[PDB]
Structure formats: C-alpha cells, structure tokens
Amino acid sequence: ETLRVDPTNDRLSALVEIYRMMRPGEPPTREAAESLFENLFFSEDRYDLS
Amino acid sequence: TTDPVRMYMREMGTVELLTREGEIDIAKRIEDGINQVQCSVAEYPEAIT
Numbered sequence: 001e002t003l004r005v006d007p008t009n010d011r012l013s014a015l016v017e018i019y020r021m022m023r024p025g026e027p028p029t030r031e032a033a034e035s036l037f038e039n040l041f042f043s044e045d046r047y048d049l050s
Numbered sequence: 051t052t053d054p055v056r057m058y059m060r061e062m063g064t065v066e067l068l069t070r071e072g073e074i075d076i077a078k079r080i081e082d083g084i085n086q087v088q089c090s091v092a093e094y095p096e097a098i099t
Contacts (some may be wrong), residue, residue, distance in 0.1 A: 025051045025060070 003009070010028030012030075020024070045049060051057065091098055 025056050028061070 015030065015033045015037065016028040018037050019028035022036050024030070
C-alpha cells in the first residue's frame with residue numbers, strides 16, 4: 001500500500017532526501033549529500049579523537 | 051525559511067560567473083558610454099563653460 005501511495009525506490013533519491021533533510025532549502029549536490037552523510041558521524045575528524 | 055542567508059545565497063545562487071571577456075566587455079561598454087557622455091560635454095552650452 002505504501003508503494004501504491006509512493007513510488008520512490010532508489011538510493012540516490014535516498015541521498016538527495018538525505019541532503020534535503022540535512023540541508024533543507026539547500027541544493028543537493030552528490031558529493032555534498034554524501035560527504036555530509038559520511039564525514040558527519042563516521043569521520044575521525046568529528047569523533048574528535050577522544 | 052526565515053533566514054536571509056538562505057534567501058540571499060539562493061538569490062545570488064541565481065546568477066552565474068561571466069569570465070575572461072565579459073569582464074573586459076563590461077569595462078568596454080562602460081568606457082564607451084563614458085566617452086559618449088564626454089562627447090555630450092564636447093557639444094556644450096553654458097552648462098560646462
């Protein structure tokens with residue numbers, strides 16, 4: 001029933017919507033959405049190093 | 051969005067960068083028009099004197 005209501009079934013839309021929740025009103029760009037998605041809370045930079 | 055930064059960056063986000071002759075073309079149109087106002091000076095009444 002969800003697919004009958006909503007047809008998005010792709011990852012890159014997942015990543016654009018990732019950008020869009022993360023950067024709402026901001027233009028999704030792919031390395032931006034992805035580097036956002038990754039570097040935020042899996043980079044060593046953030047997990048400061050403690 | 052309430053932020054003028056998103057608004058402004060989206061609004062500057064509209065227009066692109068025009069490079070390597072449009073800069074000099076802006077300069078040339080500018081100087082041309084300028085040259086023609088000083089022409090208009092060259093064909094003066096008392097105004098200039």
